[PDB]
């Protein structure tokens, strides 16, 4: 269950949109990144419960939309800017400075293992899919074969290397080989439900395990060789619990969701049970949720923008 362990108030006079936890740098140390529309800050632990701001980066014109975590990168922070759709992706680093990484009609973006960042733009025959690498500066850009169906989300497949998954506007799932750039397979998912947003994908025994969001989450099991979907697991709110899925995050085998309620709900994905509820503190509905990438914590944020950090065990 959930133990409130620390917290972060960020009276930034700007709407808070996202948070994430990463290791920074001459030594790995767990930090928290907060993003508001017009400012992004890096924070370190002041003591057992308090956080202090170490760096800040400012954005005028186009508002910050999300943080984009990149596994195995500790010397910069990537963010996506845009009012609704993504227009730019920037890298923030230190004395604070920033670099424009990509610019245009961006539809989807995902940080990948080993310092890569994948993104896609356009919609059809115009679609491009690109994976860049950081050393770290703009080093390589490999195109991937586009499915010419708008990509809605990426997910790196846990349990293999070099497999990348996408979902498309067509309710299709695509798999690429990250090494060759090849599009290996396209597979339609029952025309609903339906999703659209893949939170996590796993490979085990030649089967694909795919977590989507609606029943608050769905696990679809697909045989990649036949293309056929082989079963489906449901994650549902307990006996009495109002609320529909609104957004969420999955780390390893845990899933968190912000419900239309305003409550956050948690599942262990192995077992399928809702392992905790977390009502809004005060009257402030939870605005975003993210698992910590450095440790065993759940980050829950309000537009306020106060962040509450819980210990999961």
């Amino acid at each position: 269950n959930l133990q409130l362990v620390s917290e972060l108030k960020n009276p930034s006079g700007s709407c808070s949109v996202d948070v994430s936890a990463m290791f920074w740098e001459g030594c790995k140390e767990p930090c928290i990144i907060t993003a508001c529309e017009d400012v992004v800050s890096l924070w370190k632990a002041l003591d057992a419960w308090q956080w202090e701001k170490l760096y800040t980066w400012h954005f005028a014109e186009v508002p910050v939309l999300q943080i984009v975590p990149v596994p195995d990168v500790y010397n910069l922070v990537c963010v996506a800017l845009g009012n609704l759709e993504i227009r730019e992706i920037r890298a923030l680093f230190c004395s604070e400075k920033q670099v424009l990484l990509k610019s245009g009609n961006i539809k989807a973006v995902l940080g990948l293992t080993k310092r890569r960042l994948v993104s896609s733009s356009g919609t059809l025959s115009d679609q491009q899919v690109e994976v860049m690498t950081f050393a770290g500066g703009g080093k390589e850009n490999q195109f991937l074969m586009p499915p010419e169906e708008t990509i809605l989300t990426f997910a790196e497949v846990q349990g293999m290397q070099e497999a990348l998954l996408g979902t498309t506007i067509m309710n299709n799932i695509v798999i690429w080989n990250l090494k060759t750039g090849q599009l290996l397979k396209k597979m339609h998912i029952d025309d609903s439900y339906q999703a659209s947003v893949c939170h996590k994908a796993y490979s085990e025994m030649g089967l694909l395990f795919i977590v989507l969001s609606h029943p608050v989450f769905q696990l679809i099991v697909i045989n990649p060789k036949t293309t056929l979907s082989v079963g489906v697991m449901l994650y549902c709110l307990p006996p009495g619990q109002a609320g529909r899925f609104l957004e969420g995050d999955v780390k390893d085998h845990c899933a968190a969701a912000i419900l239309t309620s305003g409550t956050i709900a948690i599942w262990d994905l192995l077992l399928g049970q809702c392992t905790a509820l977390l009502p809004p503190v005060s009257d402030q509905h939870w605005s975003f949720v993210k698992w910590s990438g450095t440790d065993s914590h759940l980050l829950a944020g309000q537009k306020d923008g106060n962040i509450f950090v819980y210990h999961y065990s």
Binding site: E162, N177, K185, M205, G206, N223, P224, K225, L228, V230
Partner: peptide
């Protein structure tokens, strides 16, 4: 009888 292939990935990559 939907066959499962534990090597589907390198297979298609080949």
């Amino acid at each position: 009888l939907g066959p499962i292939s534990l090597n589907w990935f390198e297979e298609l990559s080949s």
